[PDB]
Assembly symmetry: C4
Homo-oligomer: 388 residues x 4
């Protein structure tokens, strides 16, 4: 009821615990579950919810055939209660569109959806369930944004957007909203070469986004934002623990201000918590495919170009499929520090499990513990063969 | 919590953005979705909802066979959350009946449903979820009303009703309600020859309804209402951009106070925002069939009998089916002016897609932007062949 | 928030309008609708709801075979929103049992359910969602009650119960509860010979119940209750318009203090509003079967043993099935007088439509209008053949 | 809104009445009902709810094959409204895990779920819908807890946990939480030899848990807790009415401080209300199988090693299956004493009804009456043959 302010620092991440899990495609085999992809989690002052881009069909309906494709008039951003499946009957539509981001500012929620053809797309910014601002395509080639939650600090919420090429120079802007209205915007600055899909968090009045260079880097771009001054910088993560996918095998020395060459024109959405000795990177286990997921503690990963892992945790075993991951935190929990959390998307169907005609996913989420807890692995758990 | 007053004027409509979309018949192929028709949208001070006349069946049930017919004992007015499908489990029944209108007055909602045989029909007016007033048929031939939201101004809400012939002179009355009770009623005055289905909005303490002459005019009737004085007038739209369907091809000169001859005994429910230079008309693209939908900016359309389009926007392409459209606005949004919005009904099944035995629809809604946004088209999206 | 008091008299019933309708068995053919019977309606200060005794199955499930039988461990009293079908997902269970009654007292709701074997049954009285009092069988032969709403007056709510024979003398008691606790109880007094299923209402601090003599009368018993004094009397309705079913054809002269002979050992639950010149009786049209339903205005029906109809209204045509009916009113509506209302149960399945193995129903409800409205008939509307 | 305090004593249990019943597997044959097991009931200050460990599937889906197994990544603790079935659409997830307990403290709810492999498991304690404390396995062999509600007294809520062998010495600890944080913990003391599954209640500021010795006793262990002093003791029940299953036939003399030999390495979760002359024990009727359930009044059962039944009540007949039972009470009901209540789990599927591939259950619950009520039996009621 007054605007939230990033007042705390992160607690110390010594291991991760299960927070939420869906079992969406399992239950989906016999329930009216919606086909989704590009999920994320976001919290209000009184509840946290699971979010995704709907495809406008149930998994078992006939229109599910074809949902490998990313953009269409039948997609929407829906939220549903924590750890329940996206069900036709329990979801709330936030806005109509095929790219999105959302964050609550302490007083109410801002949601952003984008739709259009590839060359004549637009964003409309919803604040308190109503449309307030609308932005049009600047470079006329798939205007897109984060695909996970943004963060606010005393009313100002910055969002990162890219319009242009995913295979060479694009035009990225950082927009600063306050109550749904534009306060200012900046073109990208700093040394990062291409930005796609920022996964962001804040603490001690500073905002950190770990994004994806789709053009040429197996190491990830980092944008750091001042929300009072409204300025930013960008860099790449220095460490040789490369975290994008597909990617080359890990080196001995890394790169802070240039892409690491290896794979070109591809990638995945990912994240990291960067906090000096307390730094944890997440990544796929496969260097070739979106298979498995681990978390790795790599001290000073951002600055030390020779930093190697100190500790780890396996979240999905390499035989199972993962997909996109991103960061969130509940800024309204009691306690002295912010607890780090993340989700991982578990994609099922095409392109890897080609004997079905659909593509859907479930979610697993995790948050930090200061204890050293034992680990388990958290796979989707459906058997594709039941859908035949 | 005190009665709402039309205090503002319209913002400037420079283009339209997606507000809501259902994907109802797509999801309906495998979910418990109700068969509807004659939809509309209406807002409360804290939420906006989607509304329709139910048929009392799921699309995929066996009783769906036969729902081409308009009037029966199994129909009802239902509202459900914005952009969700009308589902057996998520809908709220407002009243029992086969014609309806509804509007919130700032303190609570008035809903009106009509039922009966053709010659012995009646309306009962619900205020705050309870029945308060009841009106009986005056001309004993299908007593009907708006099929979209009415509007109030400091407690008084006028509703337009026609009883009689749809193929020659009928008796139309304007009723003025305050808290569900009748304050006054008037027979139709002015030059309009036949009234059916008013689509209404208000601004600066004046109410505008664009209706359908089913008898003999391809140009539309307009009733303008003073809610303080409780009086009205009627006229036709002057412009040669004819907006009813079926209709003759557009002329060079139009008619302000007489019907334009061409098609007789037929039509569709439609709307317009009439605001001097800021005027936009909506219509089907086909002059013969309810196929496609466009919006056209036609300065001074109401008064200038030679007015031609200045700008446009395509909402449904001509290969797809549309059907009824109507106007709404959220009178309780923050900001200096009222934002114009509309819905379009996308009818599927009989009479055009004769290989199925049912008739249902979905909704698409749009609201104004002052920006010049790019366009996309918004078709229903189901494949009839999956229902065979 | 203080106890409700019957302060008003009835308005003048000049005709009846639709209030609610279910279309339950229609929608039930393809939705998860529960098998019910013995329905009724009851209102709170802020909403009115539909109520019934569940069978513990969906209409289309396999356990529906056998639901002709009245008493079992799988039945429960459920309420759901007005004019929606009893759905597995939208119903609220009030208490577990095979006979019930319920009424709100201004502060909260009292619900009573009975279960057991035929000879060792018991009632438990729930007040504010919790169990408070429990009564055991006195005559050890199906302890039963109203099967519709009771009524309260400044906290005291009387309920009528019969334990014993349905084919000769039973023991009927009137119990007076206040906050779920027993204040007093009385054995039946007056001239009525057998009581089953009271359908009750109140006005001007007096309570009227019209019940069913299952032993030997085609004319109905009437109990009148003083809730301040906590006393009652009973009589039969004087008029020759016999309203039970099965029944003999109507006579010329009737009986005030004795049963009218004709049919023995059978009947149906029914009701009447008894208010001098303003008196309306409801009944089946068939004298042999539960088919059709009409309402008949019969001045002074209670006292004049020669009273004949003055006006009428048909609610279900004789070709369709009806079943039980009962009275309710919304005691918390605005206005000077109480509006009379009623429901009728539309039974489908065994014993009359023997080609299916289940028995279920839907509801139609109606309330008074002072206007003279036109009529329509309101049948269930399912086609049994779709269930084969 | 201030912490609850166990201020009252128990009322006198003279017989038991139905409180809630599910009919879950009956309705499950044609509805989207979840596969559960290990149920229990727990109340808040304004409502009571039904709780269970989900399997992540609908009964009728294909992933139900295999749900005989107890631990996996697809299980979760869900609550749903009283006497409704656990439905995919109506359940709320409390936490992710395969062992659990929960209790409300007057201000909000604490929930505890455990997951992991058998040797590297962990608990995370949720308070007010958020994760607060996390405990790791101490003996590295299935860290488990109560499987029913815990109880609080002025903010402090003790929970009992066992880590280790279920077939010889394990390490049991009593933990005392206040607002989700650990205040203190104790290893087991007293004479009980092995603890599994405590079923607990409190009155007059003292907490009583009746548990299961899985190692070697047909008589049950009892832990009594002081929540102000935070200390406990343990004993076995003295009476020869043995209440575990499988068990030997009842003796003449019993044992207070040693296990009664007979069956080794097996058992079931059960409970008792121990209150001097007012003492009631519940048990399976079969000494060999989980079939039937009765309640038996056995004065001073805890202290008198020769105590025999005085009165009884049959809850499930011996031909039907039962399974786990446990205690609850609504500490926020009006009145002078606490009313005793219990649930019984009715297991259907494998291992006893081997012609299906799944294992699920329904619930029946009962609470005390001071009246002497008649009895009925409350079986699950599904027919397995409909699932073939
Ligand atoms: C009970 O529960 C507890 C809690 O979970 C369990 O304890 C945990 O066990 C985990 C598994 O062993 C363990 O995680 C590992 O931690 C290593 C840290 O160890 C180093 O430091 C510590 C302290 O100094 C020393 O003890 C240790 O000797 C080491 O010095 C990480 O190094 C591990 O990650 C690496 O291995 C895994 C496979 O094990 C890889 O998938 C991962 O990517 C890492 O290795 C690749 O990348 C590095 C960095 O570039 C390369 O050096 C390496 O060669 C690999 O490179 C190839 O592979 C990658 C990916 O395939 C590819 O990109 C690249 O090109 C190459 O092909 C691992 O994270 C936890 O730390 C530990 N937790 C605690 C608190 O103890 C316990 O075991 C459980 N079990 C039981 C039975 O009780
Ligand atoms: C990216 O996004 C942007 C935003 O959408 C796109 O820009 C928009 O593009 C639209 C499509 O071209 C455009 O809409 C048209 O606007 C015309 C206005 O133009 C006139 O004025 C402007 C300014 O003076 C001039 O630039 C221009 O030269 C003109 O002078 C409208 O006239 C258009 O509508 C008419 O055409 C369509 C088909 O294009 C018809 O369906 C429509 O009904 C109109 O034509 C019929 O009716 C008129 C009036 O009676 C007749 O004159 C005409 O002959 C037609 O009559 C027949 O057809 C009807 C219906 O079938 C029938 O009843 C009758 O009997 C006859 O049979 C059209 O609306 C937007 O204005 C423009 N927006 C902006 C801000 O720029 C951009 O293109 C996108 N694309 C890309 C690739 O980036
Ligand atoms: C438009 O809408 C309006 C509003 O609905 C319609 O107007 C209404 O029309 C109704 C149908 O005609 C009408 O209802 C009838 O009212 C009669 C009252 O009439 C008497 O008084 C008035 C005023 O004095 C006079 O005008 C009139 O001439 C009469 O004197 C009732 O008598 C009618 O009920 C009886 O008839 C029906 C069939 O019509 C029976 O089912 C019913 O049970 C009644 O008859 C049986 O019972 C009586 C009493 O014992 C016996 O006398 C009689 O012989 C029958 O007995 C047999 O049948 C029963 C049941 O089967 C059985 O038990 C027994 O043993 C015997 O076998 C009827 O109710 C409304 O009053 C009228 N409303 C108004 C405000 O005008 C209008 O028509 C609509 N239509 C159009 C086309 O516009
Ligand atoms: C209407 O409703 C009312 C209310 O329900 C009904 O009234 C109730 O009826 C119940 C059934 O008869 C009755 O319950 C029984 O109560 C006995 C208490 O009786 C003793 O005390 C009273 C007062 O002094 C005397 O009247 C009476 O004569 C006795 O002295 C219990 O003893 C009964 O339980 C035992 O029997 C059942 C079968 O009936 C067993 O299943 C149960 O486990 C008990 O017996 C076993 O265990 C004991 C203890 O060790 C052994 O002594 C015994 O030999 C059995 O041992 C074998 O079996 C067990 C389990 O199989 C196994 O472990 C062991 O190894 C051995 O193999 C029973 O509980 C209610 O008390 C009564 N209520 C009231 C208020 O009256 C009325 O009937 C209804 N019906 C009608 C038609 O109106
Ligand atoms: C955030 O900071 C502003 C001052 O910068 C203050 O007014 C506001 O109330 C703060 N947030 C909260 C929750 O107090
Ligand atoms: C999906 O669609 C393609 C063509 O659009 C068709 O070949 C394929 O068989 C479809 N899948 C199914 C299961 O029908
Ligand atoms: C509408 O106008 C009346 C006076 O005409 C005023 O009392 C009322 O409060 C106004 N509405 C609002 C929301 O203030
Ligand atoms: C619809 O009903 C008609 C007759 O009422 C019948 O010919 C037709 O086949 C029905 N449709 C279906 C799919 O049964
Ligand atoms: C009902 O009557 C009592 C006095 O008899 C009064 O206290 C109570 O408040 C009355 N009900 C209402 C709603 O005022
Ligand atoms: C209902 O049950 C009876 C025997 O209990 C059986 O004959 C009948 O066929 C059943 N109905 C159906 C449709 O199975
Ligand atoms: C419980 O006891 C404490 C004092 O021991 C008191 O503060 C608290 O308010 C009590 N609970 C209630 C509901 O009053
Ligand atoms: C369950 O799974 C086993 C093997 O995992 C298989 O033999 C069995 O037939 C399955 N049950 C069904 C009904 O498919
Ligand atoms: Ca890349
Ligand atoms: Ca026309
Ligand atoms: Ca009778
Ligand atoms: Ca044992």
């Amino acid at each position: 009821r007054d605007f939230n302010n990033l007042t705390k620092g992160l607690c110390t991440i010594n291991s991760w615990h299960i927070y939420g899990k869906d079992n969406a495609v399992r239950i989906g085999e016999d329930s009216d579950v919606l086909v989704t992809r590009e999920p994320y989690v976001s919290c209000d002052p009184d509840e946290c919810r699971f979010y995704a881009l709907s495809q406008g069909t149930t998994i078992r309906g006939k229109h599910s055939n074809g949902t490998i494709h990313d953009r269409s008039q039948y997609r929407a951003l829906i939220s549903w209660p924590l750890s329940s499946p996206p069900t036709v009957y329990n979801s709330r539509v936030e806005c109509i569109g095929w790219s999105s981001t959302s964050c609550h500012d302490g007083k109410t929620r801002m949601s952003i959806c984008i739709s259009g053809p590839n060359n004549n797309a637009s964003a409309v910014i919803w604040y308190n369930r109503r449309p307030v601002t609308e932005i049009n395509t600047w470079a006329r080639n798939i205007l897109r944004t984060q695909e996970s939650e943004c963060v606010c600090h005393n009313g100002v919420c910055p969002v990162v957007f890219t319009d242009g090429s995913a295979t060479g120079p694009a035009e990225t802007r950082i927009y600063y909203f306050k109550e749904g209205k534009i306060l200012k915007w900046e073109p990208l600055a700093g040394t990062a070469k291409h930005i796609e899909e920022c996964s962001c968090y804040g603490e001690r009045a500073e905002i950190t986004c770990t994004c994806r260079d789709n053009w040429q880097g197996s190491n990830r771009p980092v944008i750091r934002i001042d929300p009072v001054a409204m300025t930013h910088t960008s860099q790449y993560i220095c460490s040789p623990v490369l975290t994008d996918n597909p990617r080359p095998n890990d080196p001995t020395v890394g790169k802070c201000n240039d892409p690491y060459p290896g794979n070109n024109n591809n990638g995945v959405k990912g994240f990291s918590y960067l906090d000096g000795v307390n730094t944890w990177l997440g990544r796929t286990i496969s260097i070739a495919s979106r298979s498995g997921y681990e978390m790795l503690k790599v001290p000073n990963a951002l600055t030390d170009d020779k930093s190697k892992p100190t500790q780890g945790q396996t979240i999905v075993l390499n035989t199972d499929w993962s997909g996109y991951s991103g960061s969130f935190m509940d800024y309204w929990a009691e306690g002295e520090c912010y607890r780090a959390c993340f989700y991982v998307e578990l994609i099922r169907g095409r392109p890897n499990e080609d004997k079905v005609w659909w593509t859907s996913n479930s979610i697993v989420s995790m948050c930090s513990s200061t204890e050293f807890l034992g680990q388990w692995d958290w796979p989707d758990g459906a058997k594709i063969e039941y859908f035949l």
